[PDB]
């Protein structure tokens, strides 16, 4: 059922859509990081230092 999706057009179709799919992941990451307050990721951010000891 998956052999129909493999060929040169789909190679081009994947490459055409990858800068976008990568940038949506960056959106999701920053988005998840910002929303839960992941001080694990956010401690290393040069202005966001709300954990100001």
């Amino acid at each position: 059922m998956l052999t129909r999706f493999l060929g040169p057009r789909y190679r081009q179709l994947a490459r055409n859509w990858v800068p976008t799919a990568g940038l949506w992941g960056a959106v999701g990451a920053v988005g998840l990081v910002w929303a839960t307050d992941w001080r694990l990721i956010l401690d290393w951010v040069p202005y966001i230092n709300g954990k100001f000891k």
Binding site: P8, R9, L13, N16
Partner: protein
């Protein structure tokens, strides 16, 4: 053998020589027994004032009805008797008068064009007869939904600019235009550096230049010493015109973004992208199996009676987009499917469909350039827009350069997140609101 490549080199170079007048005189030779000869003029509606809007169109009605050397009938009688055909046309940017005749009849053909173009007997009795003729043609054109929507699209896209005007002008300007109004435009525009004598067929460029000096030389003496007119840029407006008429059985919709103009190298990639989307009409036999996704979805779901893409070019500007005709209940779906294809091409154009687009375009270009009339037209227009004849091998060169990346870069440049000019006519209740149309000019996923 003969490869497609080799064939392009075999087509002889369009030979250009210039008169002291500034009349560019050009020809493409062949072994043909016939020919087409014409004068292409750098005049149209874009040069007109608002107060003389039907002026060029009016001269076009008067040009074949008498001269100082051939009063009334005489011209017709001469052209008719040698078996020749004599035609004319006027766009917003270009006016042309051409003769299809036997190659041996080229001496009289050029002679008659000279008389038509220089010695127009604008007899006041004939201008009055033409007044009724043009007014009657205005009522005639009203019934052509396609002619209207494009005038409407021009009117709204080029809001307030000379390009917004139609070629024929408004009724009042036909009713009130005088011989003076007509002579003035004639003298200001039918000047030698804005005229190209074009020919194609069984010719000799030597013989044509001889004739051009024989009959057109007579525009020397003094030229351009008081006033010179150069075209001002025309503002494009992303706008909508909706003429709601629930008594016409099918809706006409023409939607377009601003194009770049004649000169721009990226008209090629646009044309390729247009070729991919193409054109459909209910008498096409292909239906479901058509390559263009819009054409196939149109055919399957009968979404449409006809659609066609266009890339209308003017100096430094244009109209890029599609026009369709359909039933009242199918306008929405037609827009969606059209705009979805523009976006598909903007973001995710694939390599093979771009080959098909290139292939359709090489075929179109070579099919069009068949016979003396289309080629003579191409010489005249090309010289007026590109300043030269762009040879076929150069077109092939510039076509072959377009790949998938080119299409999506170029389609995005012109289509992506750009304001359409939209013109609608007929049963248009279901025609999407401008905001909605404008929202189809981008994708939230991209």
């Amino acid at each position: 053998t003969a490869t497609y490549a080799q064939a392009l080199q075999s087509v002889p170079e369009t030979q250009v020589s210039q008169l002291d007048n500034g009349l560019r005189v050009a020809s493409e030779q062949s072994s043909q027994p016939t020919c087409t000869v014409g004068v292409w003029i750098d005049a149209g509606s874009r040069y007109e004032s608002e107060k003389n809007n039907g002026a060029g169109y009016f001269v076009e009605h008067l040009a074949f009805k008498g001269t100082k050397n051939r009063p009334g009938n005489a011209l017709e009688k001469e052209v008719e008797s040698m078996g020749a055909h004599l035609n004319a046309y006027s766009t917003r940017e270009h006016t042309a008068y051409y003769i299809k005749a036997l190659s041996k009849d080229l001496p009289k053909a050029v002679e008659l064009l000279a008389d038509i173009v220089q010695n127009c007997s604008l007899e006041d009795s004939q201008i009055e007869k033409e007044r009724d003729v043009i007014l009657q043609e205005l009522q005639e054109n009203d019934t052509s939904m396609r002619d209207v929507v494009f005038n409407y699209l021009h009117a709204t896209a080029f809001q307030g600019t000379p390009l917004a005007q139609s070629v024929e002008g408004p009724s009042e300007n036909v009713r009130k235009l005088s011989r003076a109004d007509l002579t003035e435009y004639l003298s200001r525009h039918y000047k030698a550096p804005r005229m190209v004598l074009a020919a194609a067929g069984g010719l000799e460029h030597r013989q044509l230049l001889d004739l051009a000096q024989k009959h057109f030389s007579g525009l020397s003496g003094t030229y351009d010493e008081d006033a010179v007119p150069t075209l001002s840029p025309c503002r494009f407006t992303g706008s909508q015109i909706c003429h709601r008429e629930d008594g016409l059985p099918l809706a006409h919709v023409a939607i377009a973004v601003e194009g770049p103009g004649w000169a721009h190298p990226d008209n090629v990639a646009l044309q390729v992208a247009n070729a991919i989307i193409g054109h459909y009409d209910c008498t096409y036999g292909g239906g479901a199996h058509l390559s263009s996704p819009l054409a196939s979805i149109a055919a399957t779901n009968k979404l449409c009676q006809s659609f066609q893409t266009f890339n209308i070019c003017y100096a430094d500007t244009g109209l890029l987009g599609a026009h369709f005709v359909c039933d009242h209940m199918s306008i929405d779906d037609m827009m969606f499917v059209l705009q979805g294809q523009w976006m598909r091409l903007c973001t995710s154009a694939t390599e093979s469909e771009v080959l098909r687009g290139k292939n359709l375009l090489r075929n179109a270009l070579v099919s069009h350039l068949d016979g003396t009339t289309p080629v003579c037209e191409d010489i005249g227009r090309s010289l007026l827009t590109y300043g030269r004849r762009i040879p076929l091998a150069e077109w092939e060169s510039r076509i072959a350069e377009v790949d998938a990346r080119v299409v999506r870069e170029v389609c995005s440049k012109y289509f992506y997140d750009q304001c359409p000019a939209v013109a609608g006519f007929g049963p248009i209740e279901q025609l999407p609101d401008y905001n909605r149309i404008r929202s189809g000019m981008f994708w939230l996923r991209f």
